[PDB]
Symmetry: C5
Subunit: 272 residues, 5 copies
């Protein structure tokens, strides 16, 4: 597709998604949350034990593994919060209403949260935090620990960049016609935002709660194996999650996805 | 293919499989079991001697080598037990009966068992357990050993995750139109389920019997080469396999493949 | 496409680019600068801590990661300065005048500058320079310092090489028709020009200003962690950048991209 | 292509191959042997100097490099002996006679042997055995040495496994319609058989004669370079090759390729 | 395309190239030489500092990097010498005369030499030999030194093997129709001949003269950094290059390209 055609199909997807039946949107958001949880589990598995490997190569491979979740979302038509920020193109064109925008945003947000929590529960019940002699759980705990130590502006900017990359991956997916065209065009754009450590709202909704669960309910054998204590991650709290991470990263995701990609492309190809 | 057409072709495949001749289904189940045995053998060869490599990269490469088996099943049209769980989509639409589904499931399960046992016999007769100064047999023994030390809930959840990933790979291949559309879209979902160590019934009924026979009839030279004894794998018995692994993993596979993918997508795209 | 058709579509791209509204070209140039800076951030991330890695393999991996930005430029229709030097094919045939080409070049250059500066600001606000205990900022500073120690002749020749490779990658994408035709054919040409350390104007006007910003506004904790001082990069000034690097590299880019690819292929396939 | 269409085109290819001109078949078999020797040369080049590297990664990369030769035979239409076992499908359908099967098999075998010997001569005259301070010749000698130490049952089973993998690589390439569809789908099945040490007749009639030639005619400088002696490979003999390796591996290839792939698919898709 | 259609399109390409205007052939030969020197610069950059990396993996990755030059030659239609040997198919069918083939070969040879020399000048004026602190120039010198120490028969056989691989890569690209089929089908055949150290005339035309330039005109700081002296490269002379390298390598290239690929396939698919 030509870029004007990509803008047109983006507008069509925006009007199509916002007018869907709300319960169908809720189930699709649940599946999208499960897909992002799957992608982050793959990222954690790939980066387990890579303390001796080069930092950049390990981050790049982990980001490549994380690209599976967005591929699943696009191919299966799941409703992902960061991917549905592009339906603001339809709002800017006047083809959907502000109320529809807000309702779809809230519905997809809640659905991704529910799916992420359900996959967190299923992930905990599988005993995966003890694989690699507990290095899996320690990897999750270290990932969730550094994600709550950022400032407000810093976290907002990381979210802006993360959803900018995600929305650029989704827009480049509109150009392709075949399955490989859509899938392979999102590998590098997603590996870019994951390897750089940009903050993703739905990914954080799986990582930080899973770290909290591991910290709260870890067996003594896990702490003996990893050589750590729960006192080392005392900042892994739900309130700290919402304050330090969730709100600024979600705001940054909204700003990035809406203003930087969708609105600029609507201005350039669709305002006239 | 769009997700609605994807659900439609999934319903078509579910109807087609249940209505095939029993002998054709049995033969294709045998071939699917052989394909999964081939994939896990490729995985074992790919993970030989990686005690020094990072855990994540080794598991990811081994999982990528495992994608060959599901690609073989999809391209050659063989009935894998986890893939035939997706005939529940046709069952939920009323196009097939409960008895047909049960007969097809039992036939495919028996065929998978026969194929896995035949490939176990072929692998034993080929002398492959002595590869890499016996490290191939060592890898087989340790892979089979940790598969029988999971609790019932843990094994059920691991099977749920494994068959969820496998059925997501199979469902996404419905979107593909050409050969490499189907092939390359399935590398990541299977590499994930292998790298994360999720328990798959069909791969288990190959490797756990493989490790059992290796432990039972290994030559003394192998034991001197590996620096081990049959005593350290004393729990690798057939009854231990059936109780600790086979039943919970099969139950988890059924639950995941049916409810999480098949019935969810039937509800979303085929309920009305 | 055959080479004659490739030259014809290059001609059409040259006239079509030179006839957009000036604001549209400015916006597309800004997005092109943002994409190239995304690619360069990916290059820094993928090559952080690769001091123990072989020089060539780390450079190649970073260059492959850098290919994301130019793929974004070609797929999304962004206006890159080194890619718009190919519109000289349209000028050589007389379908556009010298004034249109000069105005288009100035507009694209200024838009690229604005985009690179905005992305520099965004990456500074995110705190990315402290990644890997300051190794990310250290890699940024090392890359920026090495690029200002080239004399005029070597800088001009390196720009010639860089834009020759960029314009060859752009030219090869004209042959392809699908998205993966255009995507994969430009991975190796960009990876080779990044790995070999050729001087790209648009990449540099994001790289060096970011190094200047890091030098000026880094916290003393960063310097303590990296074991260096801001005095060790005293040559990273704006005027030194503009004189020793920007001007010769831009001149070399223009010469390479225009003469070596554009006018040469116009002579071969369009002069008769 | 669906599996029924794949079986149909397999039948058509089997009928076409058996009825071609004997001289054209001989020349195609010569080119196929040359292609297989090229693949094994690439394999040895890739796997030289990897004593310190993990067994799994080294074998997998060597197998990926081996994929080139099979793609050469498939795309160029060369007659590979293992691939021409699949023309037994035509025999089972009665569309060709037993004598046609025997004549085609003998012609392709002789042509493959002639091509392998010609490439052995060309590789010996090129002085490639001294690459990397003699590590190339040492790799050839060591890999050839271990291939003649297998018992008859081991050789038969290894040939069965190898040619099964090769014939499944060929069979799924029937599904593909594009050149790269046939190419990439065959990389994993060939890499699986190479990495797992499975025994291929055509590859062996190149390697073992190459090892014999290297042992017999190497200069003493090569021997001092490798730190070994020709006495260390006393079992690399022509008679030992023919007895312990060629006959059983060929028997295993015939049995596997005929019964397990061709006849199985004929039973499933062609008997009715 | 089928092998018969591939031979037909090879004949068409041979007829078309021989009947082009001499100046167009000269310009395309210059661009082809530039492309091949681009490939060799990529190969040198990728393999810089891989003295600790295994020999096989380093050579294979370098061959992956070298495949860029052939992609440029096939996609952009440039006249590269070993590729233009395949016009012997047209001569064998009688569609072109001996004189046309002779002038075409001479023109392509001279243009390739001119392009390689101009690009040697471009890289020497860029200071690339100082990359990686003298390791880039040292790598070029080491690559150039080993190529001029091969015997006449060894050089002829290396050229034969190299040109066989190039003509198989080109002849395999005829089947592919879009850009990505042609591009990807050539990476492995080129990586095979580059990793194995086979001798390519046009590649040597850039390699050895570049090493001569580095030896003659390098600053003494280069010699102190690399810890070597120009006395260690006394055999790197222009006359030495032409005698020991250029003539036998070109003879082997012609023999390979003519007899092995072009004439054999003409006999198989076009004589009768």
């Amino acid at each position: 597709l030509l870029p004007a055609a990509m803008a047109k199909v983006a507008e069509e997807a925006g009007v199509y998604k916002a007018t869907k039946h709300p319960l169908k949107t809720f189930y699709l958001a649940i599946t999208a949350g499960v897909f992002i949880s799957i992608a982050f589990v793959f990222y954690i598995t790939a980066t387990t034990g890579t303390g001796t490997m080069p930092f950049g190569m390990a981050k790049l491979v982990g980001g490549i593994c994380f690209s599976l979740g967005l591929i699943l979302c696009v191919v299966c038509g799941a409703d992902l919060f960061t991917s549905t920020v592009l339906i603001v193109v339809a709002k800017a064109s006047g083809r959907i209403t502000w109320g529809q925008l807000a309702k779809n945003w809230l519905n997809v947000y809640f659905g991704n949260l529910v799916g992420a929590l359900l996959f967190v529960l299923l992930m905990w019940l599988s005993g995966e935090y003890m694989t690699a002699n507990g290095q899996w759980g320690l990897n999750v705990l270290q990932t969730a620990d550094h994600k709550v130590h950022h400032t407000f502006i810093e976290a907002v900017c990381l979210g802006i960049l993360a959803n900018l990359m995600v929305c650029l991956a989704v827009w480049m997916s509109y150009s392709g016609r075949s399955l490989m065209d859509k899938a392979f065009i999102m590998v590098l754009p997603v590996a870019m935002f994951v390897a750089s450590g940009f903050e993703h709202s739905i990914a954080n909704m799986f990582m930080i709660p899973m770290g909290i669960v591991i910290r709260d309910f870890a067996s003594p054998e896990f702490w003996t194996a990893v050589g750590s204590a729960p006192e080392n991650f005392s900042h892994l709290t739900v309130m700290n999650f919402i304050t330090d991470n969730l709100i600024p990263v979600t705001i940054g995701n909204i700003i990035g996805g809406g203003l930087l990609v969708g609105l600029t492309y609507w201005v350039i190809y669709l305002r006239e």
